[PDB]
Amino acid sequence: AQSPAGFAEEYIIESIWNNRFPPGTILPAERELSELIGVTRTTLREVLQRLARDGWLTIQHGKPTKVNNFWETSGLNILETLARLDHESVPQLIDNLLSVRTNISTIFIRTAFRQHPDKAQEVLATANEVADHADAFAELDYNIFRGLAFASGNPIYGLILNGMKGLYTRIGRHYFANPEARSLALGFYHKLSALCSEGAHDQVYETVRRYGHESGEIWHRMQ
Amino acid sequence: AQSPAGFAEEYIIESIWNNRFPPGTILPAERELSELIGVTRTTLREVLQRLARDGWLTIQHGKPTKVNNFWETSGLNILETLARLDHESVPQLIDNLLSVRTNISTIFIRTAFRQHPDKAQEVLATANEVADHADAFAELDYNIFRGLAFASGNPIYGLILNGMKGLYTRIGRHYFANPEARSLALGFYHKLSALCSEGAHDQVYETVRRYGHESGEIWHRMQ
Ligand SMILES: CCCCCCCCCCCCCC(=O)SCCNC(=O)CCNC(=O)[C@H](O)C(C)(C)COP(=O)(O)OP(=O)(O)OC[C@H]1O[C@@H](n2cnc3c(N)ncnc32)[C@@H](O)[C@@H]1OP(=O)(O)O
Numbered sequence A, B: 001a002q003s004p005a006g007f008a009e010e011y012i013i014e015s016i017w018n019n020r021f022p023p024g025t026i027l028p029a030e031r032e033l034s035e036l037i038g039v040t041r042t043t044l045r046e047v048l049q050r051l052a053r054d055g056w057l058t059i060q061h062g063k064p065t066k067v068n069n070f071w072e073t074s075g076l077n078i079l080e081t082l083a084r085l086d087h088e089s090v091p092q093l094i095d096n097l098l099s100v101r102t103n104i105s106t107i108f109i110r111t112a113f114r115q116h117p118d119k120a121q122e123v124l125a126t127a128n129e130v131a132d133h134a135d136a137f138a139e140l141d142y143n144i145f146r147g148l149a150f151a152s153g154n155p156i157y158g159l160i161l162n163g164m165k166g167l168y169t170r171i172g173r174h175y176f177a178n179p180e181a182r183s184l185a186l187g188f189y190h191k192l193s194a195l196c197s198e199g200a201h202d203q204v205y206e207t208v209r210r211y212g213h214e215s216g217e218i219w220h221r222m223q
């Protein structure tokens, strides 16, 4: 089911990870690499292009190809790669990701309440008739955080969130299987609507942080 | 100098923008599209793959290709595309981007001071012997914000920042041409070092916001 290009890409990535190709070193020449992996030169060129695009490698025409430290070259889209290939960083990464979600959402949620309260309420209202199951909630939660990011009026927040949908719902489907996770979330969306209704922009920060800690307790107990 | 693939990609993107291909509609069939643009079917397939990857289109094997609203599908890497092709959103987007930079840096800078103060100081010290010119400062500024993002211990902040280097230094080279922009920045890095030295984690938020407003005044006067 895995194409030769797919096999080649995965082999190079894992080789960087296990250090066959340590970050900061150059990749063996293409003939050698293609013979080692078992793919044509055309297949290898295409795979190197994709890996360079995702920040794993730096390529320059007519020059050796360097292995990067992806931590300083890659963007958010590698999160799904680390996940797919089961990197060791995954567990702590989701915690890091949820911490980031909590903290930057304190920013755009407050802005959304100040700038476009009606849109924010519209987004929050979607929680009203949601089905009581994991799948419905993972979907709902993603749309509420993203909808509020969009409602801030600063689209950069939405672009940040845009790629995690799959990963996002993934963590969410596991998390929202717990009815208590679903209840805390409904309480959270309801309190956000109230705060936006009351124009209590100042209370957003502590409310979101509190939901971060508590949802954190539930998540950790689970996992 | 522009390849046929490059011409094809740019033509489709601009067509979405000027609405020849409105978001939510499907793209004309491939034979028609390739004849319209003047590229082979192979070239078009490769270009559609790239556009789908960047979120402009949604493709599904054996199904019509849909034109997306990139605002809800694309990630941060499209910022350089909007820039390259001169979208109308560009001017306000950089303001949005600088607002985001200010607000999320309040988060990771404070965390960096609390978690890895030595690394944070090391990063800030790089300002000490920097050359007094636009290029040196744009480079320095990017490395200090990213270095502090890395020093927070949460690598997600670094991944967010990682792609803007080119765009980042671009805005920075224009901004730091002004000696006053360079002076305010040095004052800012020096004050951050002092705060980290004093363990005054609580003052990070207002200091960064203040630098955001003031650097904002300089930038706007310029532009
Ligand atoms: C926008 C970018 C894209 C990210 C979005 C995509 C992510 C996919 C979304 C997943 C699907 C949604 C389903 C869910 O709702 S799961 C949500 C479960 N919550 C959760 O896992 C906790 C998230 N963490 C947080 O919200 C914050 O980390 C805390 C509020 C808990 C803490 O704030 P921080 O700023 O990060 O650190 P601080 O120094 O204040 O406090 C440290 C203290 O906090 C605890 N802690 C618990 N979980 C933590 C994470 N993830 N990071 C850091 N600390 C975390 C303590 O263990 C810690 O130390 P202490 O000894 O003092 O308790």
Ligand SMILES: CCCCCCCCCCCCCC(=O)SCCNC(=O)CCNC(=O)[C@H](O)C(C)(C)COP(=O)(O)OP(=O)(O)OC[C@H]1O[C@@H](n2cnc3c(N)ncnc32)[C@@H](O)[C@@H]1OP(=O)(O)O
Pocket (backbone or CB within 6 Å): B094, B095, B096, B097, B098, B099, B100, B101, B102, B103, B104, B141, B160, B161, B164, B167, B168, B169, B171, B172, B175, B209, B210, B211, B212, B213, B214, B215, B216, B217, B219, B220
């Ligand atoms: C991490 C994600 C990737 C982003 C990094 C890549 C970006 C490339 C980096 C560019 C290279 C660096 C060179 C430079 O140092 S240029 C820096 C110049 N500063 C600057 O342009 C101002 C940045 N804006 C801000 O810092 C904040 O917006 C403010 C502190 C000014 C305001 O905070 P916000 O939260 O955004 O809004 P708030 O409601 O509190 O205040 C609104 C008030 O602020 C003014 N304002 C000025 N510039 C503004 C931007 N960019 N957005 C929003 N408001 C901005 C006012 O006009 C506004 O209304 P008021 O009538 O009340 O004054």
